[PDB]
C-alpha cells in the first residue's frame, strides 16, 4: 500500500536510535575502554539494521553493519578502543541518517 508513508514512520524511529548512538559516542570519548556504551550502540545498530533491511532503505543497514563490526571487535576486546575506531563510527552513524533522509 502506502510505501512512502510506511518508510517515513520507520525512518523517524531509526533516526531516534541513531541520535542515541551519537550521544553515547560523546560519552564514550570520555570512557573509551568502557564496554557499557558500546554494548548499547551495538544493539541500536542491530535493531535499526534489521528494520532498515526489511523496509528496503537506501544503504542504512549496510552502513550500520560496518559500524557494528567496529563496535563488535571493541566488545570482544580485540582492540583498545582507539579514537580512530570512534572516528569511523561517527561517519557511519552520520551516513545512516543521510540514507534515511533520502528514502523519504
d(CA 34, CA 51): 28
∠ CA 86-68-13, nearest 5°, is 100
Q: In the block, which residue shows the cell 551516513?
A: 95
Domain segments of the chain as ranges: 1-104
- Positive or negative, the CA dihedral 15, 20, 26, 28 is negative
Helix boundaries (H) for the chain: 3-28, 35-55, 60-75, 83-103
Long-range contacts of 13-17 (CB under 8 A, 24+ apart): 13/51, 14/48, 14/51, 14/52, 14/57, 14/60, 14/96, 14/97, 14/100, 15/97, 15/100, 15/101, 17/44, 17/47, 17/48
Please state, in angstroms and rounded to a whole number, the distance separating the CA atoms of residues 86 and 99. Answer: 20
Q: How far apart are CA 94 and CA 50, in angstroms?
A: 18
Amino acid at each position: 500500500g502506502s510505501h512512502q508513508e510506511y518508510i517515513k514512520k520507520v525512518a523517524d524511529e531509526l533516526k531516534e536510535n541513531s541520535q542515541n548512538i551519537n550521544d553515547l559516542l560523546k560519552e564514550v570519548e570520555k570512557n573509551p575502554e568502557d564496554m557499557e556504551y558500546w554494548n548499547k550502540i551495538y544493539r541500536l545498530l542491530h535493531t535499526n539494521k534489521e528494520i532498515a533491511e526489511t523496509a528496503g532503505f537506501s544503504s542504512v543497514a549496510k552502513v550500520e553493519h560496518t559500524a557494528m563490526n567496529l563496535v563488535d571487535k571493541m566488545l570482544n576486546s580485540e582492540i583498545k578502543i582507539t579514537s580512530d575506531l570512534i572516528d569511523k563510527i561517527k561517519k557511519k552513524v552520520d551516513m545512516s541518517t543521510r540514507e534515511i533522509d533520502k528514502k523519504v
